[PDB]
Write a protein that binds this ligand. Structure first.
Ligand SMILES: CC1(C)CN(c2ncnc3[nH]c4ccccc4c23)C[C@@H](CC(=O)O)O1
Length: 167
């Protein structure tokens, strides 16, 4: 039993809710919140900008030190950093950004990072400003992630479309 509330069950291990991931993280304080990161961990907008804003820019300060030490992530890769006031840990995952021309096949590699964590609160990777089709992202999630994932979808219209079209 866990503290996630109000989710629709899609499969054995995937759950979905119309929610603001920042507010959901603030209430649940999950072990892991996933950020929709880029390779530079520049958290300017979308999910990343909102998560970083909620940490009062502490996420960005920590991320800048990470990059200065380690260099950029790979598209499809991830790193574990602090969850600050939102979660124990933040798993920064880089899905391909279609608006930069990155290969959508890398979306499966991106979701594979979730399998290193037993339970996660997450957005749909490569959705929103990353330019991928969220219905496709949900399909890849369900077919790739085997651990327990709680997906927060900010847009109510999109949430209803994802549910109604789910196979
Ligand atoms: C993850 C998606 C697919 C969907 N959107 C969200 N996802 C998770 N929580 C969210 N709360 C919100 C509040 C207001 C507007 C959007 C959201 C939102 C953001 C979009 C931008 C991005 O690319 O990050 O991507």
């Amino acid at each position: 039993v866990n503290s996630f509330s109000g989710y629709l069950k899609l499969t054995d291990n995937v759950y979905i809710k119309n929610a603001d991931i920042v507010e959901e993280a603030k209430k649940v304080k999950p072990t892991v919140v996933v950020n929709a990161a880029n390779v530079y961990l520049k958290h300017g907008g979308g999910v990343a900008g909102a998560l970083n804003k909620a940490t009062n820019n502490a996420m960005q300060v920590e991320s800048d030190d990470y990059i200065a030490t380690n260099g950029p992530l790979k598209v499809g890769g991830s790193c574990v950093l602090s969850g600050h006031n939102l979660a124990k840990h933040c798993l920064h995952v880089v899905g391909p950004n279609v608006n930069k021309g990155e290969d959508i096949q890398l979306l499966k590699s991106a979701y594979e990072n979730f399998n290193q964590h037993e339970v996660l609160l997450a957005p749909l990777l490569s959705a929103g400003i990353f330019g991928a089709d969220p219905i496709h992202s949900l399909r890849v999630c369900v077919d790739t992630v085997r651990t327990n994932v709680y997906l927060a979808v900010f847009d109510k219209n999109l949430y209803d479309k994802l549910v109604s079209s789910f196979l």
